[PDB]
PDB file of C-alpha atoms and ligand atoms in Angstrom:
ATOM      1  CA  UNK A  26       0.000   0.000   0.000  1.00  0.00           C
ATOM      2  CA  UNK A  27       0.843   3.704   0.179  1.00  0.00           C
ATOM      3  CA  UNK A  28       2.614   3.444   3.531  1.00  0.00           C
ATOM      4  CA  UNK A  29       4.879   0.731   2.152  1.00  0.00           C
ATOM      5  CA  UNK A  30       5.341   2.277  -1.309  1.00  0.00           C
ATOM      6  CA  UNK A  31       6.546   5.636   0.028  1.00  0.00           C
ATOM      7  CA  UNK A  32       9.170   3.932   2.228  1.00  0.00           C
ATOM      8  CA  UNK A  33      10.524   1.101   0.072  1.00  0.00           C
ATOM      9  CA  UNK A  34      10.329   3.110  -3.157  1.00  0.00           C
ATOM     10  CA  UNK A  35       8.970   6.610  -3.818  1.00  0.00           C
ATOM     11  CA  UNK A  36       5.552   8.254  -3.939  1.00  0.00           C
ATOM     12  CA  UNK A  37       4.119  11.575  -5.080  1.00  0.00           C
ATOM     13  CA  UNK A  38       2.057  14.132  -3.187  1.00  0.00           C
ATOM     14  CA  UNK A  39      -0.725  13.414  -5.670  1.00  0.00           C
ATOM     15  CA  UNK A  40      -0.826   9.755  -4.612  1.00  0.00           C
ATOM     16  CA  UNK A  41      -0.886  10.882  -0.974  1.00  0.00           C
ATOM     17  CA  UNK A  42      -3.884  13.105  -1.775  1.00  0.00           C
ATOM     18  CA  UNK A  43      -5.886   9.920  -2.313  1.00  0.00           C
ATOM     19  CA  UNK A  44      -5.870   9.338   1.431  1.00  0.00           C
ATOM     20  CA  UNK A  45      -7.397  12.664   2.404  1.00  0.00           C
ATOM     21  CA  UNK A  46     -10.962  12.617   3.716  1.00  0.00           C
TER      22      UNK A  46
ATOM     23  CA  UNK B  18       6.043  18.965  -6.695  1.00  0.00           C
ATOM     24  CA  UNK B  19       8.836  16.419  -6.372  1.00  0.00           C
ATOM     25  CA  UNK B  20       8.560  12.731  -5.597  1.00  0.00           C
ATOM     26  CA  UNK B  21       9.010  11.608  -2.011  1.00  0.00           C
ATOM     27  CA  UNK B  22      10.837   8.977   0.028  1.00  0.00           C
ATOM     28  CA  UNK B  23       8.873   8.859   3.300  1.00  0.00           C
ATOM     29  CA  UNK B  24       9.106   6.302   6.113  1.00  0.00           C
ATOM     30  CA  UNK B  25       7.591   6.192   9.575  1.00  0.00           C
ATOM     31  CA  UNK B  26       6.239   9.413  11.041  1.00  0.00           C
ATOM     32  CA  UNK B  27       7.561  11.318   8.031  1.00  0.00           C
ATOM     33  CA  UNK B  28       4.717   9.885   5.940  1.00  0.00           C
ATOM     34  CA  UNK B  29       2.173  11.042   8.508  1.00  0.00           C
ATOM     35  CA  UNK B  30       3.667  14.514   8.458  1.00  0.00           C
ATOM     36  CA  UNK B  31       3.375  14.570   4.678  1.00  0.00           C
ATOM     37  CA  UNK B  32      -0.249  13.393   4.775  1.00  0.00           C
ATOM     38  CA  UNK B  33      -1.037  16.140   7.289  1.00  0.00           C
ATOM     39  CA  UNK B  34       0.449  18.808   5.026  1.00  0.00           C
ATOM     40  CA  UNK B  35      -1.231  17.512   1.854  1.00  0.00           C
ATOM     41  CA  UNK B  36      -4.710  17.089   3.351  1.00  0.00           C
ATOM     42  CA  UNK B  37      -4.928  19.937   5.859  1.00  0.00           C
ATOM     43  CA  UNK B  38      -8.377  20.468   7.334  1.00  0.00           C
ATOM     44  CA  UNK B  39      -9.728  17.619   5.219  1.00  0.00           C
ATOM     45  CA  UNK B  40      -7.894  15.125   7.426  1.00  0.00           C
ATOM     46  CA  UNK B  41      -6.761  11.729   6.263  1.00  0.00           C
ATOM     47  CA  UNK B  42      -6.602   8.012   6.964  1.00  0.00           C
ATOM     48  CA  UNK B  43      -3.248   6.360   7.755  1.00  0.00           C
ATOM     49  CA  UNK B  44      -3.589   2.691   6.773  1.00  0.00           C
ATOM     50  CA  UNK B  45      -0.405   0.596   6.767  1.00  0.00           C
ATOM     51  CA  UNK B  46      -0.309  -3.076   5.858  1.00  0.00           C
ATOM     52  CA  UNK B  47      -0.140  -5.600   8.706  1.00  0.00           C
TER      53      UNK B  47
ATOM     54  CA  UNK C  12      -2.290  20.242  24.208  1.00  0.00           C
ATOM     55  CA  UNK C  13      -1.640  18.309  20.979  1.00  0.00           C
ATOM     56  CA  UNK C  14      -2.372  20.282  17.825  1.00  0.00           C
ATOM     57  CA  UNK C  15      -1.703  20.019  14.131  1.00  0.00           C
ATOM     58  CA  UNK C  16       1.260  17.929  13.070  1.00  0.00           C
ATOM     59  CA  UNK C  17       1.989  17.301  16.744  1.00  0.00           C
ATOM     60  CA  UNK C  18      -1.417  15.640  17.171  1.00  0.00           C
ATOM     61  CA  UNK C  19      -0.873  13.402  14.143  1.00  0.00           C
ATOM     62  CA  UNK C  20       2.661  12.544  15.332  1.00  0.00           C
ATOM     63  CA  UNK C  21       1.095  11.358  18.608  1.00  0.00           C
ATOM     64  CA  UNK C  22      -1.579   9.305  16.828  1.00  0.00           C
ATOM     65  CA  UNK C  23       1.159   7.621  14.822  1.00  0.00           C
ATOM     66  CA  UNK C  24       2.988   6.900  18.066  1.00  0.00           C
ATOM     67  CA  UNK C  25       0.055   5.357  19.923  1.00  0.00           C
ATOM     68  CA  UNK C  26      -1.602   3.586  16.943  1.00  0.00           C
ATOM     69  CA  UNK C  27       1.356   2.515  14.803  1.00  0.00           C
ATOM     70  CA  UNK C  28       0.537  -0.440  12.563  1.00  0.00           C
ATOM     71  CA  UNK C  29      -3.118  -0.320  13.615  1.00  0.00           C
ATOM     72  CA  UNK C  30      -3.411   2.855  11.574  1.00  0.00           C
ATOM     73  CA  UNK C  31      -5.613   5.761  12.504  1.00  0.00           C
ATOM     74  CA  UNK C  32      -7.852   8.491  11.199  1.00  0.00           C
ATOM     75  CA  UNK C  33      -7.340  12.221  11.600  1.00  0.00           C
ATOM     76  CA  UNK C  34     -10.707  13.936  11.011  1.00  0.00           C
ATOM     77  CA  UNK C  35     -10.498  17.495  12.350  1.00  0.00           C
ATOM     78  CA  UNK C  36     -13.886  18.532  10.954  1.00  0.00           C
ATOM     79  CA  UNK C  37     -15.449  15.788  13.131  1.00  0.00           C
TER      80      UNK C  37
ATOM     81  CA  UNK D  19     -13.884  15.564  17.940  1.00  0.00           C
ATOM     82  CA  UNK D  20     -10.170  14.874  18.330  1.00  0.00           C
ATOM     83  CA  UNK D  21      -9.303  18.567  17.938  1.00  0.00           C
ATOM     84  CA  UNK D  22     -11.685  19.535  20.711  1.00  0.00           C
ATOM     85  CA  UNK D  23     -10.624  16.697  23.027  1.00  0.00           C
ATOM     86  CA  UNK D  24      -6.877  16.849  22.462  1.00  0.00           C
ATOM     87  CA  UNK D  25      -5.933  20.303  21.097  1.00  0.00           C
ATOM     88  CA  UNK D  26      -8.542  22.695  22.492  1.00  0.00           C
ATOM     89  CA  UNK D  27      -8.755  20.655  25.685  1.00  0.00           C
ATOM     90  CA  UNK D  28      -6.125  18.096  26.810  1.00  0.00           C
ATOM     91  CA  UNK D  29      -6.196  14.335  26.362  1.00  0.00           C
ATOM     92  CA  UNK D  30      -4.183  11.334  27.474  1.00  0.00           C
ATOM     93  CA  UNK D  31      -2.379   8.939  25.162  1.00  0.00           C
ATOM     94  CA  UNK D  32      -5.086   6.448  26.154  1.00  0.00           C
ATOM     95  CA  UNK D  33      -7.735   8.870  24.885  1.00  0.00           C
ATOM     96  CA  UNK D  34      -5.653   9.190  21.712  1.00  0.00           C
ATOM     97  CA  UNK D  35      -6.123   5.462  21.141  1.00  0.00           C
ATOM     98  CA  UNK D  36      -9.805   6.192  20.498  1.00  0.00           C
ATOM     99  CA  UNK D  37      -8.724   7.290  17.008  1.00  0.00           C
ATOM    100  CA  UNK D  38      -6.792   4.174  16.039  1.00  0.00           C
ATOM    101  CA  UNK D  39      -8.185   1.811  13.423  1.00  0.00           C
TER     102      UNK D  39
ATOM    103  CA  UNK E  26      -0.801  28.404   8.894  1.00  0.00           C
ATOM    104  CA  UNK E  27       2.770  27.127   8.444  1.00  0.00           C
ATOM    105  CA  UNK E  28       5.275  28.675  10.832  1.00  0.00           C
ATOM    106  CA  UNK E  29       8.805  28.062  11.983  1.00  0.00           C
ATOM    107  CA  UNK E  30      10.133  24.541  11.638  1.00  0.00           C
ATOM    108  CA  UNK E  31       6.744  23.519  10.262  1.00  0.00           C
ATOM    109  CA  UNK E  32       7.146  25.964   7.363  1.00  0.00           C
ATOM    110  CA  UNK E  33      10.624  24.656   6.544  1.00  0.00           C
ATOM    111  CA  UNK E  34       9.398  21.042   6.812  1.00  0.00           C
ATOM    112  CA  UNK E  35       6.771  21.910   4.178  1.00  0.00           C
ATOM    113  CA  UNK E  36       9.317  23.590   1.891  1.00  0.00           C
ATOM    114  CA  UNK E  37      11.449  20.466   2.099  1.00  0.00           C
ATOM    115  CA  UNK E  38       8.391  18.409   1.200  1.00  0.00           C
ATOM    116  CA  UNK E  39       7.350  20.428  -1.846  1.00  0.00           C
ATOM    117  CA  UNK E  40      10.861  21.323  -3.128  1.00  0.00           C
ATOM    118  CA  UNK E  41      12.923  18.244  -2.261  1.00  0.00           C
ATOM    119  CA  UNK E  42      15.989  17.878  -4.471  1.00  0.00           C
ATOM    120  CA  UNK E  43      15.304  21.244  -6.108  1.00  0.00           C
ATOM    121  CA  UNK E  44      16.360  22.840  -2.840  1.00  0.00           C
ATOM    122  CA  UNK E  45      14.849  25.992  -1.449  1.00  0.00           C
ATOM    123  CA  UNK E  46      15.519  29.172   0.450  1.00  0.00           C
ATOM    124  CA  UNK E  47      14.011  30.181   3.773  1.00  0.00           C
ATOM    125  CA  UNK E  48      14.403  33.969   4.134  1.00  0.00           C
ATOM    126  CA  UNK E  49      12.079  35.161   6.907  1.00  0.00           C
ATOM    127  CA  UNK E  50      13.437  38.719   6.914  1.00  0.00           C
ATOM    128  CA  UNK E  51      12.306  38.994   3.259  1.00  0.00           C
TER     129      UNK E  51
ATOM    130  CA  UNK F  15       7.639  37.334   2.215  1.00  0.00           C
ATOM    131  CA  UNK F  16       7.108  33.644   2.942  1.00  0.00           C
ATOM    132  CA  UNK F  17       6.332  34.337   6.611  1.00  0.00           C
ATOM    133  CA  UNK F  18       3.641  36.828   5.686  1.00  0.00           C
ATOM    134  CA  UNK F  19       2.151  34.657   2.927  1.00  0.00           C
ATOM    135  CA  UNK F  20       2.284  31.300   4.688  1.00  0.00           C
ATOM    136  CA  UNK F  21       2.497  31.854   8.474  1.00  0.00           C
ATOM    137  CA  UNK F  22       0.729  35.161   9.117  1.00  0.00           C
ATOM    138  CA  UNK F  23      -1.703  34.451   6.292  1.00  0.00           C
ATOM    139  CA  UNK F  24      -2.290  30.987   4.748  1.00  0.00           C
ATOM    140  CA  UNK F  25      -0.771  29.561   1.584  1.00  0.00           C
ATOM    141  CA  UNK F  26      -1.158  26.486  -0.582  1.00  0.00           C
ATOM    142  CA  UNK F  27       1.561  23.942  -1.263  1.00  0.00           C
ATOM    143  CA  UNK F  28       1.597  25.398  -4.784  1.00  0.00           C
ATOM    144  CA  UNK F  29       2.363  28.829  -3.322  1.00  0.00           C
ATOM    145  CA  UNK F  30       5.091  27.139  -1.273  1.00  0.00           C
ATOM    146  CA  UNK F  31       6.756  26.096  -4.526  1.00  0.00           C
ATOM    147  CA  UNK F  32       7.513  29.780  -5.127  1.00  0.00           C
ATOM    148  CA  UNK F  33      10.417  29.326  -2.695  1.00  0.00           C
ATOM    149  CA  UNK F  34      12.053  26.338  -4.361  1.00  0.00           C
ATOM    150  CA  UNK F  35      15.361  26.744  -6.165  1.00  0.00           C
TER     151      UNK F  35
ATOM    152  CA  UNK G  12      -0.364   0.930  22.680  1.00  0.00           C
ATOM    153  CA  UNK G  13       1.824  -0.612  19.994  1.00  0.00           C
ATOM    154  CA  UNK G  14       5.532  -1.332  20.126  1.00  0.00           C
ATOM    155  CA  UNK G  15       7.912   1.210  18.642  1.00  0.00           C
ATOM    156  CA  UNK G  16      10.939   1.405  16.358  1.00  0.00           C
ATOM    157  CA  UNK G  17      12.509   4.772  17.241  1.00  0.00           C
ATOM    158  CA  UNK G  18      15.923   6.130  16.238  1.00  0.00           C
ATOM    159  CA  UNK G  19      17.516   9.535  16.635  1.00  0.00           C
ATOM    160  CA  UNK G  20      15.266  12.488  17.387  1.00  0.00           C
ATOM    161  CA  UNK G  21      12.222  10.249  16.987  1.00  0.00           C
ATOM    162  CA  UNK G  22      12.997   8.678  20.370  1.00  0.00           C
ATOM    163  CA  UNK G  23      13.181  12.109  21.982  1.00  0.00           C
ATOM    164  CA  UNK G  24       9.836  13.022  20.477  1.00  0.00           C
ATOM    165  CA  UNK G  25       8.343   9.840  21.899  1.00  0.00           C
ATOM    166  CA  UNK G  26       9.809  10.500  25.355  1.00  0.00           C
ATOM    167  CA  UNK G  27       8.345  14.012  25.265  1.00  0.00           C
ATOM    168  CA  UNK G  28       4.877  12.681  24.461  1.00  0.00           C
ATOM    169  CA  UNK G  29       4.994   9.888  27.059  1.00  0.00           C
ATOM    170  CA  UNK G  30       6.300  12.026  29.931  1.00  0.00           C
ATOM    171  CA  UNK G  31       4.687  15.409  29.298  1.00  0.00           C
ATOM    172  CA  UNK G  32       5.107  17.900  32.122  1.00  0.00           C
ATOM    173  CA  UNK G  33       7.024  15.312  34.130  1.00  0.00           C
ATOM    174  CA  UNK G  34       9.990  15.705  31.785  1.00  0.00           C
ATOM    175  CA  UNK G  35      12.541  13.010  31.153  1.00  0.00           C
ATOM    176  CA  UNK G  36      16.203  12.088  30.895  1.00  0.00           C
ATOM    177  CA  UNK G  37      17.701  11.148  27.507  1.00  0.00           C
ATOM    178  CA  UNK G  38      20.714   8.926  28.233  1.00  0.00           C
ATOM    179  CA  UNK G  39      22.324   7.164  25.261  1.00  0.00           C
ATOM    180  CA  UNK G  40      25.326   4.878  25.549  1.00  0.00           C
ATOM    181  CA  UNK G  41      28.729   6.299  24.595  1.00  0.00           C
TER     182      UNK G  41
ATOM    183  CA  UNK H  19      20.200   0.922  26.943  1.00  0.00           C
ATOM    184  CA  UNK H  20      16.794   2.314  25.981  1.00  0.00           C
ATOM    185  CA  UNK H  21      18.165   4.616  23.286  1.00  0.00           C
ATOM    186  CA  UNK H  22      19.896   1.677  21.622  1.00  0.00           C
ATOM    187  CA  UNK H  23      17.089  -0.849  22.187  1.00  0.00           C
ATOM    188  CA  UNK H  24      14.414   1.308  20.540  1.00  0.00           C
ATOM    189  CA  UNK H  25      16.578   1.785  17.422  1.00  0.00           C
ATOM    190  CA  UNK H  26      18.203  -1.614  16.865  1.00  0.00           C
ATOM    191  CA  UNK H  27      15.125  -3.564  17.973  1.00  0.00           C
ATOM    192  CA  UNK H  28      11.792  -2.348  19.369  1.00  0.00           C
ATOM    193  CA  UNK H  29      10.569  -0.810  22.615  1.00  0.00           C
ATOM    194  CA  UNK H  30       7.221  -0.062  24.233  1.00  0.00           C
ATOM    195  CA  UNK H  31       5.813   3.202  25.551  1.00  0.00           C
ATOM    196  CA  UNK H  32       5.774   1.558  28.974  1.00  0.00           C
ATOM    197  CA  UNK H  33       9.548   1.046  28.853  1.00  0.00           C
ATOM    198  CA  UNK H  34       9.936   4.679  27.775  1.00  0.00           C
ATOM    199  CA  UNK H  35       7.877   5.735  30.811  1.00  0.00           C
ATOM    200  CA  UNK H  36      10.779   4.572  32.971  1.00  0.00           C
ATOM    201  CA  UNK H  37      12.767   7.592  31.837  1.00  0.00           C
ATOM    202  CA  UNK H  38      10.245  10.210  32.903  1.00  0.00           C
ATOM    203  CA  UNK H  39      11.143  12.362  35.903  1.00  0.00           C
TER     204      UNK H  39
ATOM    205  CA  UNK I  20      11.287  30.734  21.216  1.00  0.00           C
ATOM    206  CA  UNK I  21      11.739  26.964  21.629  1.00  0.00           C
ATOM    207  CA  UNK I  22       8.776  25.220  23.227  1.00  0.00           C
ATOM    208  CA  UNK I  23       7.516  21.708  23.717  1.00  0.00           C
ATOM    209  CA  UNK I  24       8.732  19.094  21.275  1.00  0.00           C
ATOM    210  CA  UNK I  25      10.666  21.829  19.485  1.00  0.00           C
ATOM    211  CA  UNK I  26      12.682  22.520  22.647  1.00  0.00           C
ATOM    212  CA  UNK I  27      13.504  18.834  23.110  1.00  0.00           C
ATOM    213  CA  UNK I  28      14.410  18.506  19.407  1.00  0.00           C
ATOM    214  CA  UNK I  29      16.922  21.334  19.939  1.00  0.00           C
ATOM    215  CA  UNK I  30      18.370  19.737  23.084  1.00  0.00           C
ATOM    216  CA  UNK I  31      18.868  16.529  21.132  1.00  0.00           C
ATOM    217  CA  UNK I  32      20.613  18.535  18.426  1.00  0.00           C
ATOM    218  CA  UNK I  33      23.032  20.381  20.701  1.00  0.00           C
ATOM    219  CA  UNK I  34      23.657  17.558  23.233  1.00  0.00           C
ATOM    220  CA  UNK I  35      23.520  14.415  21.094  1.00  0.00           C
ATOM    221  CA  UNK I  36      25.435  11.521  22.636  1.00  0.00           C
ATOM    222  CA  UNK I  37      26.088  13.540  25.795  1.00  0.00           C
ATOM    223  CA  UNK I  38      22.413  13.117  26.604  1.00  0.00           C
ATOM    224  CA  UNK I  39      20.324  15.723  28.337  1.00  0.00           C
ATOM    225  CA  UNK I  40      17.533  16.326  30.789  1.00  0.00           C
ATOM    226  CA  UNK I  41      14.221  18.017  30.073  1.00  0.00           C
ATOM    227  CA  UNK I  42      12.746  19.161  33.412  1.00  0.00           C
ATOM    228  CA  UNK I  43       9.985  21.689  32.706  1.00  0.00           C
ATOM    229  CA  UNK I  44       8.820  21.866  36.327  1.00  0.00           C
ATOM    230  CA  UNK I  45      12.331  23.116  37.233  1.00  0.00           C
TER     231      UNK I  45
ATOM    232  CA  UNK J  26      14.256  26.758  34.292  1.00  0.00           C
ATOM    233  CA  UNK J  27      14.680  25.750  30.654  1.00  0.00           C
ATOM    234  CA  UNK J  28      11.060  26.633  29.843  1.00  0.00           C
ATOM    235  CA  UNK J  29      11.482  30.121  31.245  1.00  0.00           C
ATOM    236  CA  UNK J  30      14.881  30.696  29.612  1.00  0.00           C
ATOM    237  CA  UNK J  31      14.159  29.183  26.210  1.00  0.00           C
ATOM    238  CA  UNK J  32      10.373  29.103  25.627  1.00  0.00           C
ATOM    239  CA  UNK J  33       8.976  32.026  27.622  1.00  0.00           C
ATOM    240  CA  UNK J  34      12.107  34.050  26.915  1.00  0.00           C
ATOM    241  CA  UNK J  35      14.635  33.247  24.141  1.00  0.00           C
ATOM    242  CA  UNK J  36      17.913  31.375  24.450  1.00  0.00           C
ATOM    243  CA  UNK J  37      20.901  30.562  22.280  1.00  0.00           C
ATOM    244  CA  UNK J  38      22.022  27.073  21.331  1.00  0.00           C
ATOM    245  CA  UNK J  39      24.952  27.722  23.679  1.00  0.00           C
ATOM    246  CA  UNK J  40      22.495  28.350  26.518  1.00  0.00           C
ATOM    247  CA  UNK J  41      20.767  25.117  25.487  1.00  0.00           C
ATOM    248  CA  UNK J  42      24.006  23.266  26.214  1.00  0.00           C
ATOM    249  CA  UNK J  43      23.443  24.061  29.895  1.00  0.00           C
ATOM    250  CA  UNK J  44      20.976  21.151  29.892  1.00  0.00           C
ATOM    251  CA  UNK J  45      23.268  18.505  28.433  1.00  0.00           C
ATOM    252  CA  UNK J  46      24.550  15.687  30.620  1.00  0.00           C
TER     253      UNK J  46
ATOM    254  CA  UNK K  26      28.200  21.131  20.388  1.00  0.00           C
ATOM    255  CA  UNK K  27      28.358  17.546  19.162  1.00  0.00           C
ATOM    256  CA  UNK K  28      28.710  16.303  15.611  1.00  0.00           C
ATOM    257  CA  UNK K  29      25.575  15.340  13.721  1.00  0.00           C
ATOM    258  CA  UNK K  30      24.216  12.557  11.526  1.00  0.00           C
ATOM    259  CA  UNK K  31      21.323  14.218   9.667  1.00  0.00           C
ATOM    260  CA  UNK K  32      19.359  12.903   6.681  1.00  0.00           C
ATOM    261  CA  UNK K  33      16.239  14.149   4.947  1.00  0.00           C
ATOM    262  CA  UNK K  34      14.044  16.633   6.779  1.00  0.00           C
ATOM    263  CA  UNK K  35      16.233  16.268   9.863  1.00  0.00           C
ATOM    264  CA  UNK K  36      18.913  18.361   8.143  1.00  0.00           C
ATOM    265  CA  UNK K  37      16.379  21.081   7.383  1.00  0.00           C
ATOM    266  CA  UNK K  38      15.280  21.102  11.000  1.00  0.00           C
ATOM    267  CA  UNK K  39      18.893  21.498  12.080  1.00  0.00           C
ATOM    268  CA  UNK K  40      19.490  24.346   9.618  1.00  0.00           C
ATOM    269  CA  UNK K  41      16.378  26.094  10.940  1.00  0.00           C
ATOM    270  CA  UNK K  42      17.620  25.863  14.525  1.00  0.00           C
ATOM    271  CA  UNK K  43      21.178  26.974  13.705  1.00  0.00           C
ATOM    272  CA  UNK K  44      20.210  29.950  11.531  1.00  0.00           C
ATOM    273  CA  UNK K  45      17.020  31.217  13.164  1.00  0.00           C
ATOM    274  CA  UNK K  46      15.794  34.548  11.838  1.00  0.00           C
ATOM    275  CA  UNK K  47      18.762  34.707   9.475  1.00  0.00           C
ATOM    276  CA  UNK K  48      17.203  31.968   7.350  1.00  0.00           C
ATOM    277  CA  UNK K  49      19.181  29.605   5.188  1.00  0.00           C
ATOM    278  CA  UNK K  50      19.571  27.954   1.803  1.00  0.00           C
ATOM    279  CA  UNK K  51      18.971  24.198   1.430  1.00  0.00           C
ATOM    280  CA  UNK K  52      20.998  23.073  -1.597  1.00  0.00           C
ATOM    281  CA  UNK K  53      21.301  19.318  -2.180  1.00  0.00           C
ATOM    282  CA  UNK K  54      23.218  17.788  -5.062  1.00  0.00           C
ATOM    283  CA  UNK K  55      21.217  16.544  -8.055  1.00  0.00           C
TER     284      UNK K  55
ATOM    285  CA  UNK L  26      27.880  18.900  -0.490  1.00  0.00           C
ATOM    286  CA  UNK L  27      26.559  19.602   3.006  1.00  0.00           C
ATOM    287  CA  UNK L  28      23.270  17.782   2.452  1.00  0.00           C
ATOM    288  CA  UNK L  29      25.148  14.660   1.390  1.00  0.00           C
ATOM    289  CA  UNK L  30      27.954  14.953   3.964  1.00  0.00           C
ATOM    290  CA  UNK L  31      25.595  15.154   6.950  1.00  0.00           C
ATOM    291  CA  UNK L  32      23.737  12.007   5.821  1.00  0.00           C
ATOM    292  CA  UNK L  33      26.478   9.696   4.538  1.00  0.00           C
ATOM    293  CA  UNK L  34      28.992  10.768   7.189  1.00  0.00           C
ATOM    294  CA  UNK L  35      28.743  13.431   9.906  1.00  0.00           C
ATOM    295  CA  UNK L  36      28.714  17.222  10.044  1.00  0.00           C
ATOM    296  CA  UNK L  37      28.981  19.895  12.721  1.00  0.00           C
ATOM    297  CA  UNK L  38      26.638  22.753  13.571  1.00  0.00           C
ATOM    298  CA  UNK L  39      29.479  25.086  12.617  1.00  0.00           C
ATOM    299  CA  UNK L  40      29.537  23.686   9.073  1.00  0.00           C
ATOM    300  CA  UNK L  41      25.752  24.088   8.928  1.00  0.00           C
ATOM    301  CA  UNK L  42      26.163  27.746   9.939  1.00  0.00           C
ATOM    302  CA  UNK L  43      27.788  28.323   6.553  1.00  0.00           C
ATOM    303  CA  UNK L  44      24.388  27.969   4.918  1.00  0.00           C
ATOM    304  CA  UNK L  45      22.648  30.671   6.923  1.00  0.00           C
ATOM    305  CA  UNK L  46      21.756  33.881   5.098  1.00  0.00           C
TER     306      UNK L  46
HETATM  307 CL1  LIG M  29       8.064  18.498  14.381  1.00  0.00          CL
HETATM  308 CO1  LIG M  30      13.445  10.462  10.621  1.00  0.00          CO
HETATM  309 CO1  LIG M  31       5.015  23.051  16.511  1.00  0.00          CO
HETATM  310 GD1  LIG M  32       8.428  15.180  14.077  1.00  0.00          GD
HETATM  311 GD1  LIG M  33       9.276  16.847  11.728  1.00  0.00          GD
HETATM  312 GD1  LIG M  34      10.950  16.803  14.220  1.00  0.00          GD
END
């Protein structure tokens, strides 16, 4: 998931936006 | 914006900044 | 008092792998 | 909500566990 | 509101490898 | 400056990009 | 509460949250 | 010690409580 | 001004391996 | 104490070294 | 002062504390 | 540079002072 992807690889702020309420 | 390498609490800080008053869910795998 | 990023840092600390929700409009 | 319990007022780390999944 | 170390944490987040300048007297 | 735009007032992450190199 | 993996300043942040107004001692090995 | 244990392995908030004043 | 977690972050920075004490009631 | 010197008032990083072990 | 091992946002926090109102430039290699 | 030196090795606060404005 996003927690794992940002730490093992990289992630964008736009992907993080998917987890806003 | 640039791509991010974020582990631990650093991810939660990033989510806070991105979402602001909207809030967010932090859902790691277990 | 725990506010802003300090509140979400504390949620991370207490909840960890359980995950959590930060819903300030709630 | 959490902002009223923990930021406006004060809460314990035990109260903070109310917001875990 | 983004102030102090929280403002520079956010600059780091948005700018990353581009780098940035924090010039509060500006 | 950045303190007036982002701390005194409020700014978006897009506005924050004004201060990247 | 869950168990913790805390290095560097992250440990000091955790101690601050756990102890609050009581304060704490940070005593690494040297 | 506790500094080393939390970083090389894991530690609990209850162990950290031992270092409060 | 250095307050709260920001004060203890700064103590960590200046003291490092020497360790430090945070005693706000003092 | 440290809260009065550094939070209520202002202190230097040198003053902060007063609280090292 | 002691020497420092600082990666990521931790370096930016340190620069903020060292420089204060003077501000600073964060200039990584690319 | 200083970003890389502090992370791969070590750096002092006095070296960091060189990057203040
Ligand atoms: Cl912080
Ligand atoms: Co870190
Ligand atoms: Co703060
Ligand atoms: Gd933090
Ligand atoms: Gd931080
Ligand atoms: Gd921090």
